[PDB]
């Protein structure tokens with residue numbers, strides 16, 4: 001408690017010595033409250049006018065238009081798991097870090113690597129003006145140094161979370177987290193090659209083929225149970241099992257990683273804005289509160305662990321979570337050594353998101369360990385058996401489903417898909433202030449090129465993508481303010497990129513014959529396109545398509561006298 005967090009609390013107290021007060025009307029129940037102090041400040045979703053002017057039919061669709069308009073779970077608690085559950089998790093976690101570590105070497109990430117990431121724009125949940133200035137000033141690195149030596153001494157002064165769920169920290173605390181734990185992401189510990197259940201660094205063009213490969217295994221239904229508020233269900237036992245990665249480290253690295261887990265993950269200090277405007281300095285031990293990239297890898301680790309244990313329960317490897325006998329321990333260890341890697345291969349796991357094809361359907365009602373670990377399912381009663389999926393093309397994963405699409409030449413594409421209102425609504429939205437017309441156009445072009453690569457099979461998106469690319473100057477570079485593999489972020493011909501991604505580099509495509517034109521690239525069936533939200537069939541959509549050059553010309557007239565390319569004749573209907 002206060003020995004580990006007291007120093008951080010002490011420091012904040014004095015910078016606001018004029019404002020400190022133990023408020024008696026504090027709303028916190030599960031979060032430890034320490035004090036308050038005076039502040040005055042806050043974010044809306046702004047519309048992308050280039051995308052909206054080229055998607056007129058969607059201006060009257062509320063599921064699109066409502067997307068641009070407009071903490072009772074963070075303040076909740078999770079009970080301590082039983083002794084049998086704690087044993088299953090420790091055995092499984094010990095085994096899993098060893099498997100992940102067989103072909104990888106833990107290592108520190110460097111100021112050079114950190115500096116390069118900030119100078120190429122990447123979300124570091126951070127709070128000098130921007131990060132680029134701090135990384136160039138040596139005063140920063142001396143603050144970083146002072147904290148670094150405090151961590152080697154087993155103490156913390158400045159690693160404090162700023163709520164807004166995204167846990168922003170000052171750039172220095174972000175650096176120390178990256179130095180100790182960045183290797184999990186930088187060296188791809190959760191790649192499918194290295195973790196068997198992971199998909200880290202797999203583009204949306206890979207995920208469907210991965211689910212189809214899981215479907216080929218003999219076994220029961222495919223299960224895709226969502227957890228209710230995963231980050232809030234991470235227990236102190238989960239944090240202790242994640243910490244065991246430090247058992248694989250040495251020297252300075254081992255000490256620096258032990259401090260991140262001990263001082264910042266297992267004992268957090270947070271500042272929250274409460275209107276009543278006051279700053280609430282609160283603490284707690286449990287729950288996920290890390291940088292988004294470390295959060296992703298540790299969520300993947302703990303989900304892999306939790307799902308192997310649910311598979312053990314279904315297969316009868318242990319009888320009760322109350323307590324593991326001595327021989328159940330050896331049975332669990334022996335299961336992991338004998339079939340653990342095969343059982344990992346039966347899963348696709350992306351942080352809190354999973355798909356599992358178990359040995360049989362006993363898994364559906366194997367719920368005691370899952371509930372006792374705190375990983376309570378969404379939208380179902382605690383003890384009701386899970387509903388599985390009989391067809392891999394129906395399974396939800398990473399906000400998508402996947403279609404099997406046969407090209408006129410017989411070759412098979414497995415493509416990503418989601419309701420089209422969600423795709424159009426998201427492309428019509430931008431975040432942050434000070435967007436020029438050129439920057440807004442380049443963000444529209446990023447969405448368009450993503451649609452041409454991932455969603456070419458949706459009639460409306462291939463047409464709207466061609467229109468946006470026709471309306472934005474041909475040499476202007478696609479941009480995003482926040483950056484899976486983003487192959488659409490390029491000024492290369494998108495037909496050349498399509499061929500590279502779907503044919504040349506696609507390990508599921510044996511015939512490498514290049515496609516010569518967009519007319520060789522198929523769509524979903526007309527009825528399937530309509531099922532997944534297409535407006536084909538509506539008079540509004542027909543007027544848009546027939547008059548698209550008028551919409552393209554409206555946007556070109558706003559941007560002004562620039563060099564443009566007409567991409568519409570790459571489509572049959574505009575090709576004479």
Ligand SMILES: O=C(CCC1CCCCC1)N1CCOCC1
Pocket residue numbers: 459526536537538539542
């Ligand atoms: O049913 C249709 C055409 C559907 C087709 C379906 C395939 C893609 C192109 C469009 N119309 C009703 C509205 O007026 C225009 C004609």
Ligand SMILES: [Cl-]
Pocket residue numbers: 388389390391394
């Ligand atoms: Cl189904």
Ligand SMILES: [Zn+2]
Pocket residue numbers: 147151155156157158159263
């Ligand atoms: Zn610290």
Ligand SMILES: [Zn+2]
Pocket residue numbers: 401403417418532
């Ligand atoms: Zn679909």
